[PDB]
Paper text:
Schistosomiasis is the name of a severely debilitating disease caused by parasites of the genus Schistosoma, among which Schistosoma mansoni is the most prevalent species in the world and is estimated to infect approximately 200 million people. The parasite shows a complete dependence on preformed purines for its metabolic needs owing to an absence of the enzymes which comprise the ‘de novo’ pathway for purine biosynthesis. One key component of this pathway is the enzyme purine nucleoside phosphorylase (PNP), which catalyzes the reversible phosphorolysis of the N-ribosidic bond of 6-oxopurine deoxynucleosides and nucleosides yielding their correspondent base and ribose-1-phosphate. Crystal structures of several PNPs have been described which can be assigned to two main categories: the low-molecular-mass homotrimeric PNPs which bind to 6-oxopurines, and high-molecular-mass homohexameric PNPs that accept either 6-oxo or 6-aminopurine (such as adenosine) as substrates.
The asymmetric unit of the structure of SmPNP in complex with R1P (SmPNP–R1P) contains the full PNP trimer (6347 protein atoms) along with 368 water molecules, three molecules of R1P and three molecules of acetate. The ligand presents an intricate hydrogen-bonding network involving either ten direct and four water-mediated hydrogen bonds (subunit A) or nine direct and five water-mediated hydrogen bonds (sub­units B and C). These interactions are limited to the well defined phosphate and ribose binding sites which are lined by residues S35, R86, H88, Y90, A118, Y202, M221, S222 and H259. This suggests that the binding of R1P is not sufficient in itself to cause the loop rearrangement observed in complexes with the nucleosides inosine and adenosine. This is most notable for the interaction between O5′ of the ribose and H259 Nδ1, which is weaker in the SmPNP–R1P complex (3.4 Å and 3.07 Å in subunits A and C, respectively, compared with 2.73 Å and 2.62 Å in the SmPNP–inosine complex). The SmPNP–R1P complex is the first structure in which we observe a unique conformation for this loop suggesting that the anionic moiety may need to be covalently bound to the ribose in order to fully favour all interactions made by this loop.
Residue numbers in the entry:
A (entry chain C): 3 to 287
B (entry chain B): 4 to 61, 63 to 253, 267 to 287
C (entry chain A): 4 to 62, 66 to 287
């Protein structure tokens, strides 16, 4: 279970991190599969390997520790999680919750998150951006909600509302920023459903998910968003459609993480630009 | 906690039987903000969970109580302090109290909860008698019964036919109508959201389209255990919120306690 | 329980290889009341799970049965591992990965399922052509945890999980042997169980596009697919799902077993005739 994402352990982590950077992040960023470029476009960046943060959850790419990247992006102080924690890997809820709660204590007000997702909605094209305006947390509706277990009152209430989980204003900004910069056509809003994974969704599953009103499906993001909303961090989340969900069993096309990565590699640049440009126009600061 | 097997349950029940001579025929579980009923129990014996060895324990200030006594002439055991899965309680922990009830002699379990209203015909404060449920966690491999079956209590694969006893439902409705609040009472399908997050509009829309009428984070697990060991079940949701479907878009507590008393009043007796 | 990693799976496969010379190319898993196939295995060696170190235990003890079925080398799991029993992912995964290491190329699985699809009759066979892994979607996918690279990829696709050629072959065999009318193809949804499905659940599952519902199969199929074993799977419809909450009709396990046992011989025949027509090099 790693370390309990309670106030004491989170504070310890936050304070260790604070000793390692003068950057007080206003904006937290989680990069999805193949969506790292943004990470590297951080200016005046301090890079802190997860291995170098005591009690911070560990995730390697393959042997390599993920990184916490502090710096600025469009003149805003950010912390970027380079390497997220997917539940299908077996990570505990505390493992996934901790980094977000650390972000909260560090000063993060807005969490921006990307993921690679399958396009269920038939109108989606590979490489489309689907801003999450809502989600369906299949694991959470089951008994696998990241918040299951004693509530950490320090961070939030027992029964978080997920009413405006995907801040409608952030979404409006994101869309406008896409519109103004010539790629509004790539931008949709929709419902992301979490498949715990790690299997890609069968055609029957995709068909069911689509009929449930899901637009994109992936294996991440919702738990982080839940933790985020729980502790009052505003969320903006986008899915890169990295595969068009196959709805027919009588089909050649088979999802594969490689093509997901390829699609991510191809759209990483535009998504980075989009993110930098959204960040530039974030209010309150 | 401790496996809700016949031996561990037998022990907790035997302890309790040393603490009271009330043999309940009716078990009552009150939901969120309900349970203004535990007050109206006559000649009650309040037994704090803390006092019972191996009994699951509730949650600052308000520790749990097993309230024994009489309601509308009938012997009851009320659970003041309910155990929700989102709290991280084990299957055994949630099953044990229900099986203890069984050993203590409970024949009918009456359950109330606070639920979100999915069905668009529902209004705040409506009562939705459960006539069926969708056990999302159960289908998704978090069925309270997962693990070695405790054969002493019930069969490996319990059917959930008539799980919400139709006769009890008929009676509950008749009593509501006879008491001038029949118009508040609906019947419908309760779906369990493991929680503890409230349901997103997308989730509610999906739940509605799944044929769900109300959603909450309790009840089904207890009901499963009750049905498993042959306890008849009556269960009702107080609609305490009307679910929002699109992102782009005390009074009752005592009425319910009254309703329960009046139902119990009319419950058949051997 | 031991991790279904390559080391543990090898150890088991080797210990089994010390007890039998039969290199199985076909793995068979029998469902509720359907183990009549285990009897038809010729030149057979029966290896109680108990006789296998670190092999999952289930019950009399379960058996790995090695031998010949329609001239093809098979290994049959007499006694499978159901998640509703409390078994770990590793417990379910390991036997399938052991089969992989023993040389299994095709996994044929049966199960007893509730018939959701309203055109299904009791005792029908519904060949699985796809599945809805409700536990899987809900974060109880058997593969959750470190990926075992020796066996498979981190994110297995499940597109042709129910090998369409095996399905075609299964249907032709049924058709030519007089019981094609018994045979359907459909979507199996896993109810984690062990409760039978409520009428509202059944109604929901049906509307989700599910034809049959059971509490097994998907996890082994997923592990099989993950390690590149080809899968054929069939639900025996051992009960017609009750969608009506006012109905007196209800599932009864004794009836489920009876219905399965009644059909086991035909199913055995079918599996044998399928295996007989499997292409061989
Ligand atoms: O969600 P992200 O991290 O982007 O990654 C997604 O893509 C991967 C498989 O394609 C899974 O990890 C899924 O969750
Ligand atoms: O179901 P009861 O016990 O009514 O409580 C319900 O209300 C709480 C949330 O408002 C959750 O615990 C939910 O299950
Ligand atoms: O799937 P098989 O193994 O056939 O068995 C099924 O039959 C039982 C339910 O009747 C459960 O065990 C279910 O999994």
């Amino acid at each position: 279970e790693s370390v309990t994402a309670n106030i004491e352990n989170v504070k310890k982590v936050a304070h260790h991190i604070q000793k390692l950077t003068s950057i007080v992040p206003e904006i937290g960023i989680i990069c999805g599969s193949g969506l790292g470029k943004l990470a590297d476009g951080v200016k005046d960046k301090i890079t802190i390997p997860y291995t170098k943060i005591p009690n911070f959850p560990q995730t390697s790419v393959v042997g390599h520790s993920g990184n916490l990247i502090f710096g600025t992006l469009s003149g805003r102080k950010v912390v970027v999680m380079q390497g997220r924690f997917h539940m299908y890997e077996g990570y505990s809820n505390d493992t996934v919750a901790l980094p977000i709660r650390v972000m909260k204590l560090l000063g993060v007000k807005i969490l921006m998150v990307s993921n690679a997702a399958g396009g269920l909605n038939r109108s989606l094209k590979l490489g489309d951006f689907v801003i999450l305006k809502d989600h369906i947390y299949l694991p959470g509706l089951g008994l696998n909600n990241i918040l299951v277990g004693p509530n950490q009152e320090a961070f939030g209430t027992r029964f978080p509302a997920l009413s405006n989980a995907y801040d409608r204003d952030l979404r409006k900004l994101a869309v406008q920023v896409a519109e103004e910069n010539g790629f509004g056509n790539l931008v949709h809003q929709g419902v992301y459903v979490m498949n715990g994974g790690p299997c890609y969704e069968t055609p029957a599953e995709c068909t069911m998910l689509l009929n449930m009103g899901c637009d994109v499906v992936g294996m991440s993001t919702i738990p982080e968003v839940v933790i985020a909303r729980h502790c009052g961090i505003q969320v903006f989340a986008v899915s890169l459609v990295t595969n068009i969900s196959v709805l027919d069993v009588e089909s050649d096309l088979k999802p594969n993480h490689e093509e997901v990565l390829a699609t991510g590699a191809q759209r990483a640049e535009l998504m980075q630009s989009w993110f930098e440009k959204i960040i530039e126009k974030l209010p309150k600061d």
